[PDB]
């Protein structure tokens, strides 16, 4: 039993809700919140910009030190950093950015990072400003993630379409 509330159950391990991931994280304080990161951990917009703003830029400060030490992530890769005031940990996961020409096949590799964590609050990878089809992202999530994932979908209109078309 966990403290996630109001989710629709899609499969044995995948749950979905119309919610602002920032507000969800502040309420639940989950062990792991997933950020929709880029390889530079430049949290300028989308989910990443919103999560960073909620940390008063502390996420960006930590991220800049991480990059200065380690260099960029790989598309499809991830790193675990602090969750600041939002979660115990933040799993920064890089889905492919379609608006950069990146190979959508890497979306499965990106979701595989979730399997290293027993429970996660997460957005749909590569959705929004990363340019992928969210229906496809949800399908890849369900077919790749085996741990317990709670998906926050900000757009109410998009949430209803994902549920109604879910196979
Ligand atoms: O959910 C999508 C990604 N964007 C966010 N998701 C959750 N919480 C958020 N807070 C700020 C941005 C944001 C992906 C599916 O298409 C709709 C947008
Ligand atoms: Cl977005």
Swiss-Prot record:
Cite the Macro domain residue spans from the record: 1-167
Q: How does it sit in the membrane?
A: Multi-pass membrane protein
- So what does this thing catalyse? Thiol-dependent hydrolysis of ester, thioester, amide, peptide and isopeptide bonds formed by the C-terminal Gly of ubiquitin (a 76-residue protein attached to proteins as an intracellular targeting signal)
- Cellular localisation: Host endoplasmic reticulum membrane
Activity regulation comment:
Inhibited in vitro by GRL-0617.
Q: What is the effect of changing residue 31 to A?
A: In strain: Mu/B.1.621
**Effect after changing residue 164 to L:** In strain: Gamma/P.1
Provide the assembly information: May form homohexamers. Interacts with N protein.
Any idea what job this protein has? Responsible for the cleavages located at the N-terminus of the replicase polyprotein. Participates together with nsp4 in the assembly of virally-induced cytoplasmic double-membrane vesicles necessary for viral replication. Antagonizes innate immune induction of type I interferon by blocking the phosphorylation, dimerization and subsequent nuclear translocation of host IRF3. Also prevents host NF-kappa-B signaling. In addition, PL-PRO possesses a deubiquitinating/deISGylating activity and processes both 'Lys-48'- and 'Lys-63'-linked polyubiquitin chains from cellular substrates.
Q: What is this protein called?
A: Papain-like protease nsp3
Instruction: Write down the species.
Output: Severe acute respiratory syndrome coronavirus 2
First and last residue shown, out of the full length, are 1025 to 1191 of 7096
């Amino acid at each position: 039993v966990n403290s996630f509330s109001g989710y629709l159950k899609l499969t044995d391990n995948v749950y979905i809700k119309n919610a602002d991931i920032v507000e969800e994280a502040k309420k639940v304080k989950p062990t792991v919140v997933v950020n929709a990161a880029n390889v530079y951990l430049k949290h300028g917009g989308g989910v990443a910009g919103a999560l960073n703003k909620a940390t008063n830029n502390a996420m960006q400060v930590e991220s800049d030190d991480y990059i200065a030490t380690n260099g960029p992530l790989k598309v499809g890769g991830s790193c675990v950093l602090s969750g600041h005031n939002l979660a115990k940990h933040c799993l920064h996961v890089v889905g492919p950015n379609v608006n950069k020409g990146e190979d959508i096949q890497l979306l499965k590799s990106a979701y595989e990072n979730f399997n290293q964590h027993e429970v996660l609050l997460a957005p749909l990878l590569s959705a929004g400003i990363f340019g992928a089809d969210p229906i496809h992202s949800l399908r890849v999530c369900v077919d790749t993630v085996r741990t317990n994932v709670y998906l926050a979908v900000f757009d109410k209109n998009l949430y209803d379409k994902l549920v109604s078309s879910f196979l």
